[PDB]
Design a protein around this ligand. Structure first.
Ligand SMILES: Cc1cc2nc3c(=O)[nH]c(=O)nc-3n(C[C@H](O)[C@H](O)[C@H](O)COP(=O)(O)O)c2cc1C
Ligand SMILES: Cc1cc2nc3c(=O)[nH]c(=O)nc-3n(C[C@H](O)[C@H](O)[C@H](O)COP(=O)(O)O)c2cc1C
Ligand SMILES: CCOC(=O)/C(=N\O)C(C)=O
Ligand SMILES: CCOC(=O)/C(=N\O)C(C)=O
Ligand SMILES: [Cl-]
Lengths: 359, 359
């Protein structure tokens, strides 16, 4: 089974090709994770996945999506992650973390509490920042404040500080969240970046925030640990051909800037899109990025069955398969995939107190 | 769905009829549970089961099965369970514990480390006790020491002390382990009880240790919390008709002694048996116990498919369906059952951070 071949990137070895992608839990308070996350991540790591990327973790308070999002903007926040890192490691999985800034999509309600921007009368909300003072729209109508040059310098430092905190907490894998219409993605997209200074206008200027943030993180992130990013390479906004070509060129510059692997996703920068949802629909897009940027990739959004995950590898589209919702439904999904794929001693994807009885 | 009707017993209400039966994890050290159990139990409780009965927990060190078994023979041991109790309650499940004494099956290796008796001279092994100085045989050759009347008094008091500690840790449900060939079961079975004093020989005498332990525990266990027991009602030794009839009579005396529910199982007292290798063979047996002893019952051994569990409840065979190994494979099995049975808002069998996305 290709899905259960180990994978080595820099000096880190994943025991299989199953990655749990970042998945916000909305259960933190003031950015501080707690027993919800401890059990959530430990249980999934024991389920057998080779890599567990902890949810989008805010580099700054206003970079949270919701009042329930995790943060790593202080050392106490980072210390809260230590037992999570150690629990993922004890299960034999590799602990990773996605550090993020929600940009204009910040200051929103939890998904089951409206999923929409928090109103100005609500005391829980806050002012959002973004490259330009233009709203996402739809259920996220709050217009963000346009960032100053000092904002840009401060946020980049927040990414540096968060990467250093993630490193010191013991994460062996970091993912910069440059996707899904949050801050980084919105600097790259002309839909949301209306700037005329050095951070908007041209391709170089729109790339500048992401390339500089990557460069600043690379200076503090160890060379022997994978430095990755999630990036939306197309929007399904009717401009996919040119957007994908620009996104792949940026991925080439990420590679030259020391990025080890690209988590290929959709931009979600604006609501006015037509995303063709279907099983493994990102397959050919991830493969094109993989081949044209010559960079290892993972992807998500419909690979969450054993056969689809395996086929994505057999087809040389992905190096790692990210399986998200299936792991919320079944924290031991990796074990389920091992069985479904007829892996030898499949039950031993799990720790002995389970494996012995399921063989 | 009958499986997702709530169930009320004394002052406890289970949100559904799915019980997680006790399942030894063999991960404790000197009886002390740890982060293995914390995540294991909290994750399963979040999976949606209405009742989680924590594994066989030894009332005394020599009553462990293995060096990895949990114990509750001191207040420090009981304190270790408090976070487990509270995590199970926080997920909306009801915390239970099975208190146990392995009898002549004690001092054995973990199942995946040989599963056989450890010699008492071995630093990890110890001397076993039983109603009669007769070995189980096969891979459990250690001959136990026949218990004196003072031994009987000591062990019953250990059950009492353990029930008090379980109450103080916050357990809302207790199960006496009188099954599976351990101490209590072996007092009841003529195969293992060769005593001629007041605790062997007749039906009354063989029943005495179990009835006296129940009575002693009944004194300290709160009237408003279910007092339950697990008992092997037949052995598949060719004496099943006479054995089951005596077992149903003991269930009647259990009820008269204040037992609230009986977990019906197999004896496993000796190895020379022909136990059915198949699912749900206990259904009609448990139904007979339920109807002839007029006592609520649960059972296990192969009910871990949603349709089988639903069928056992529709047939009035069980009041609760115990689903064990399926929860080792999938801690969210209760959610999987909700889906398969077409329960409305099935995803909300799970907490919101999962439920919202699985709709
Ligand atoms: C509850 C939930 C939270 C998510 N949070 C994040 C996140 O914090 N960062 C991110 O990059 N993607 C996030 N995603 C997107 C997932 O990482 C993944 O791409 C998505 O679930 C699709 O993959 P799947 O079909 O296997 O579920 C989230 C998805 C879900 C369902
Ligand atoms: C790993 C494991 C540990 C078990 N430990 C106990 C136990 O401690 N006490 C008990 O009464 N039964 C124990 N059993 C028996 C189970 O509680 C249950 O009766 C058995 O798994 C049959 O149910 P199932 O078919 O749903 O798995 C254990 C079973 C397993 C698989
Ligand atoms: C619309 C896609 O955005 C995401 O997946 C996300 N984070 O990146 C969430 C849901 O928190
Ligand atoms: C074979 C029947 O015995 C059991 O089920 C058991 N405990 O009761 C264990 C720890 O396996
Ligand atoms: Cl000890």
């Amino acid at each position: 089974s290709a899905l259960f071949e180990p994978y080595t990137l820099k000096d880190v070895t994943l025991r299989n090709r199953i990655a749990i992608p970042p998945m916000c839990q909305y259960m933190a308070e003031d950015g501080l994770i707690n027993d919800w996350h401890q059990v959530h991540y430990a249980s999934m790591a024991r389920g057998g996945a080779g890599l567990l990327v902890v949810e989008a973790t805010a580099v700054a308070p206003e970079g949270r999506i919701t009042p329930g999002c995790a943060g790593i903007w202080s050392d106490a926040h980072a210390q809260a992650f230590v037992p999570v890192v150690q629990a993922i490691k004890a299960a034999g999985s590799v602990p990773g973390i996605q550090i993020a800034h929600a940009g204009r999509k910040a200051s929103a309600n939890r998904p089951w509490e409206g999923d929409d921007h928090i109103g100005a009368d609500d005391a829980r909300g806050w002012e959002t920042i973004a490259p330009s003072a233009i709203a996402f729209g739809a259920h996220l109508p709050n217009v963000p404040r346009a960032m100053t040059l000092d904002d840009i310098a401060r946020v980049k430092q927040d990414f540096v500080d968060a990467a250093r905190r993630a490193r010191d907490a013991g994460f062996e894998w970091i993912e910069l969240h440059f996707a899904h219409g949050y801050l980084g993605q919105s600097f790259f997209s002309e839909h949301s970046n209306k700037r005329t200074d050095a951070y908007g206008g041209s391709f170089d200027n729109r790339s500048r925030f992401l390339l500089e943030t990557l460069a600043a993180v690379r200076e503090v992130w160890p060379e022997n640990l994978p430095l990755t990013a999630r990036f939306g390479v197309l929007e399904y906004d009717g401009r996919d051909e040119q957007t994908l070509e620009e996104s792949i060129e940026l991925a080439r510059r990420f590679k030259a800037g020391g990025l080890d692997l690209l988590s290929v996703s959709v931009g979600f920068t604006i609501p006015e899109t037509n995303i063709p949802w279907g099983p493994a629909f990102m397959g050919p897009i991830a493969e094109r990025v993989r081949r044209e940027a010559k960079l290892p990739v993972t992807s998500a959004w419909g690979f969450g069955t054993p056969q689809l995950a395996e086929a994505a590898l057999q087809a040389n589209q992905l190096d790692l398969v990210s399986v998200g919702r299936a792991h919320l439904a079944d924290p031991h999904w990796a074990y389920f995939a091992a069985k479904e794929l007829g892996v030898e001693k499949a039950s031993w994807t799990l720790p002995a107190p389970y494996a012995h009885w399921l063989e």
